Enzyme design. Structure first.
Site, PDB file in Angstrom:
ATOM      1  CB  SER C  30       0.077   0.197  -6.396  1.00 29.92           C
ATOM      2  OG  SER C  30       0.893   0.280  -7.552  1.00 29.92           O
ATOM      3  N   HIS C  61       3.782  10.306  -8.602  1.00 31.03           N
ATOM      4  CA  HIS C  61       2.321  10.493  -8.373  1.00 31.03           C
ATOM      5  C   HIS C  61       2.067  10.939  -6.925  1.00 31.03           C
ATOM      6  CG  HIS C  83       2.549   1.740   1.266  1.00 29.22           C
ATOM      7  ND1 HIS C  83       2.374   2.831   0.444  1.00 29.22           N
ATOM      8  CD2 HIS C  83       1.813   0.735   0.736  1.00 29.22           C
ATOM      9  CE1 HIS C  83       1.570   2.502  -0.544  1.00 29.22           C
ATOM     10  NE2 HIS C  83       1.220   1.222  -0.391  1.00 29.22           N
ATOM     11  CE1 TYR C  85       6.747   1.749   0.017  1.00 30.18           C
ATOM     12  CE2 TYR C  85       5.256  -0.058   0.498  1.00 30.18           C
ATOM     13  CZ  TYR C  85       5.617   1.013  -0.292  1.00 30.18           C
ATOM     14  OH  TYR C  85       4.845   1.341  -1.363  1.00 30.18           O
ATOM     15  CD  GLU C  86       4.968   5.690   0.896  1.00 30.46           C
ATOM     16  OE1 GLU C  86       3.819   5.217   1.001  1.00 30.46           O
ATOM     17  OE2 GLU C  86       5.191   6.770   0.305  1.00 30.46           O
ATOM     18  CB  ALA C 113      -1.038  -5.052  -5.665  1.00 30.28           C
ATOM     19  CG  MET C 216       4.427  -4.736   1.251  1.00 34.81           C
ATOM     20  SD  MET C 216       5.665  -4.077   0.127  1.00 34.81           S
ATOM     21  CE  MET C 216       6.537  -5.595  -0.260  1.00 34.81           C
ATOM     22  CB  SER C 217      -1.273  -1.494   2.112  1.00 33.16           C
ATOM     23  OG  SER C 217      -1.978  -2.363   1.231  1.00 33.16           O
ATOM     24  CG  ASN C 240       3.497 -11.022  -7.297  1.00 38.58           C
ATOM     25  OD1 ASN C 240       2.782 -10.070  -6.984  1.00 38.58           O
ATOM     26  ND2 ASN C 240       4.339 -11.576  -6.443  1.00 38.58           N
ATOM     27  CG  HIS C 254       8.384  -1.718  -9.113  1.00 35.31           C
ATOM     28  ND1 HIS C 254       7.929  -0.531  -9.667  1.00 35.31           N
ATOM     29  CD2 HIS C 254       9.701  -1.792  -9.412  1.00 35.31           C
ATOM     30  CE1 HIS C 254       8.925   0.072 -10.290  1.00 35.31           C
ATOM     31  NE2 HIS C 254      10.021  -0.683 -10.151  1.00 35.31           N
TER      32      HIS C 254
END
Ligand SMILES: O=c1[nH]cnc2c(Sc3cccc(Oc4c(F)c(F)c(F)c(F)c4F)c3/C=C/P(=O)(O)O)c[nH]c12
Ligand SMILES: O=c1[nH]cnc2c(Sc3cccc(Oc4c(F)c(F)c(F)c(F)c4F)c3/C=C/P(=O)(O)O)c[nH]c12
Ligand SMILES: O=c1[nH]cnc2c(Sc3cccc(Oc4c(F)c(F)c(F)c(F)c4F)c3/C=C/P(=O)(O)O)c[nH]c12
Ligand code: NA
Ligand code: NA
Ligand code: NA
Lengths: 281, 281, 281
Positions: C30, C61, C83, C85-86, C113, C216-217, C240, C254
């Site tokens: 990302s 995007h 991902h 989560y999608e 990330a 998450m990937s 973070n 995010h």
């Protein structure tokens, strides 16, 4: 599985069919649901009567929304809640929480039964939930999985602040303001899917991960509540001490859970009634 | 995905087609399935021939029930078993265990291959299963997920007592009653879904959770067996020591698993044959 | 959900529509996807244009393959990745990796990330991935789940050697060969499904399991890459520091992730460009 317009349609139908405008949603755990008897101007809807609303599978007790007043607050109570172990996908389990939001509810109180992992806990104790461990969530069982609707909330909400600091204090205080021999517990709730009870090896795993109580609900509702900006408070009734060694000949059973639920009944109706006064407007 | 009448229909069809009335169900792990050669009055059914019975995906070896006598006990043996990694939902994986119950089976013996997480374990060791960690179960992959049928068992069965105390003793004893240089191991089996082998970081996780052996089967069958009240005994053949450090240039492979399986063949046929005599009636 | 001939059909269509023959596949995390601007003879395909290729859900995007040359290497870049989560099943998430293989790609570079779990890590750090913990994988969310095709790889591939030793060294070296104040980090990436951010209790769990970074990937792509024999290198941009205590009033968002992504942009384009020269032929 639901569109934004499904939740709105359900919300409006409830608004059209009650003059009650609830502020606080309460989700009653297994046999803590006598608390509907403390409501005033109680108006009852069976889940079956409400559009898009999942019907319960439990033949013994079919669930219902009860709108009413509890100790000054305009409440909606959920008696009979959904669990992963019944075979509901999490978007059905947490369907009510999004309807509550669209009714204008700004606060969710969630209650559950749980096994004690913390050795200090005793059958009949109340543990306030400071935090959760979402084991199903790690693996993909998160009720936010799928397309995100910005009208409900962000794609990536935080959960570090899920359980309201203010309400936990205002609940410790409220507990002092009664004559309770036993002290009010506080800790981490770990959600597992169930419906079978943990092995000794499993109990040891959940202790090592830092959980104080284990149950089969609540975490999905909390995530969806926070996702759309509700304030969240909750607690666990400790119904049993999870078997943590191979010597013991005691076995967890749902009879234990019901029994502890009947004993703690009066105490819990009282605690949750008084807490209404501490919820802002 | 199956109704109660699907299991009954399958059971009755098997009863109509064999005079064998089995007491003990045995599920043979990968390449411990020569044990069908020790049966007497062996009657074979390919899975494809049996109504509602999942067909195997493995082209090399298609599975079968073999009814027969092993060392005095009326047995049904499952040669070729189902795994999550093949894409079967757990209600198909554990379909046989419910059929066994309705045939009158009261005992399940489950065997598997497993990687050693306990440093003391060596390739070729046998570990009796004292307990399991059901990682898939925590996340929702429990074969009891969905409506419960009281005719099979409770909504909320305990698993703390899953692996029969009596049979574990009567198996340590039985092992003394042979000339075995190497001592009989005992420990916790952790189920992971696979089918890929663990990383070093993953192996370290499974060690920290307190698992002694890791495999890709067994736990779902054990839960459904206990759910309908079968006595359960099982063990793991340690086929490999899981790589627990980044120095090593050795990699887990299914060739290792098969090879260890050929070596331990005679030892395992013997061990399981003698154990039949220790199973009550 | 895809047949072998679906991947071949997609591969051939891409070969028919570009003279570019890529060796290295790069999956941009990302907002690390400006790196398409460093390609030369850049040829762009929107996912929608490519047969059998999942279309992205993100309206802002929409993703694309960019074929080109980066610093001597014939590259295909994935800008916009899938991902869990999608709501994509893992066989869609990892569909590109199998197409890359059939294009002739022999190396995969994966970037993401991640939140820092290791206290030593700082916002803006780069962590090379030495290893992963596949929490979804344990529970059944493994992209290899289902029938295995021997034309892609084995039923039971190992992952202990997933992250190429040679490329990690040749990347530490490459990092010395620049004027970087801050040292290059190395560690274990834990995959969780998301899309919500961890609680404090959850962060503590992931620290105790021995993870340095959480995202998450990546892990599903790595498993499928290794399954069909690609060399794999990857790293995390620490966006973070995960909240690990209840005192803090900071929350993961995010916006943080994007912001850190804009700052580290020039550094990452440079690092990955130079690394191309260290990839064999
Ligand atoms: O050691 C433990 N491990 C893991 N979990 C637990 C729980 S939670 C739980 C366990 C068994 C049945 C339960 O409740 C029903 C029910 F849901 C029924 F439908 C029913 F008929 C009944 F009898 C029950 F006891 C609940 C409550 C569910 P809640 O909605 O309060 O979160 C208590 N102890 C443990
Ligand atoms: O370090 C480890 N990690 C995690 N798991 C393990 C296992 S279990 C396992 C791993 C690979 C293939 C296996 O078995 C087949 C098979 F199932 C096949 F179909 C096949 F063709 C073959 F060659 C095998 F080896 C099994 C057995 C399965 P069981 O039914 O006994 O529980 C052993 N070692 C480890
Ligand atoms: O503390 C943490 N816990 C757990 N996970 C993380 C991650 S990863 C992540 C978290 C939120 C959004 C993210 O990325 C998008 C995006 F995917 C979007 F579509 C988007 F619109 C955006 F704004 C983002 F920031 C990513 C990156 C995903 P990648 O593909 O690089 O693996 C960072 N910090 C943590
Ligand atoms: Na709509
Ligand atoms: Na029926
Ligand atoms: Na085909």
């Amino acid at each position: 599985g639901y569109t934004y317009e499904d939740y709105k349609n359900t919300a409006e139908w409830l608004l059209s069919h009650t003059k009650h405008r609830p502020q606080v949603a309460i989700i009653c755990g297994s046999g803590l649901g006598g608390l509907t008897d403390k409501l005033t101007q109680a108006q009852i809807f069976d889940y079956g009567e409400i559009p898009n609303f999942p019907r319960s599978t439990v033949p013994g007790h079919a669930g219902r929304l009860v709108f009413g007043f509890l100790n000054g607050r305009a409440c909606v109570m959920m008696q009979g809640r959904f669990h992963m172990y019944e075979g509901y996908p999490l978007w059905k389990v947490t369907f009510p929480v999004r309807v509550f939001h669209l009714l204008g509810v700004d606060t969710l109180v969630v209650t559950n039964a749980a096994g004690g992992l913390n050795p200090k806990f005793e059958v009949g104790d109340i543990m306030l939930i400071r935090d959760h461990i979402n084991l199903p969530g790690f693996s993909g069982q998160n009720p936010l999985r799928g397309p995100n609707d910005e009208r409900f909330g962000d794609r990536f909400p935080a959960m570090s602040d899920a359980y309201d600091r203010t309400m936990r204090q205002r609940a410790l205080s409220t507990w002092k303001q009664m004559g309770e021999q036993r002290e009010l517990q506080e800790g981490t709730y770990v959600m597992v899917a169930g419906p079978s009870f943990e092995t000794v090896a499993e109990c040891r795993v959940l202790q090592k991960l830092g959980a104080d109580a284990v149950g089969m609900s609540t975490v999905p509702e909390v995530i969806v509540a926070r996702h759309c900006g509700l304030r969240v408070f909750g607690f666990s009734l400790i119904t049993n001490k999870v078997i943590m060694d191979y010597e013991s000949l005691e076995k967890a059973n749902h009879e234990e859970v019901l029994a502890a639920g009947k004993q703690a009944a009066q105490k819990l109706e009282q605690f949750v009634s008084i807490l209404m006064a501490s919820i802002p407007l």
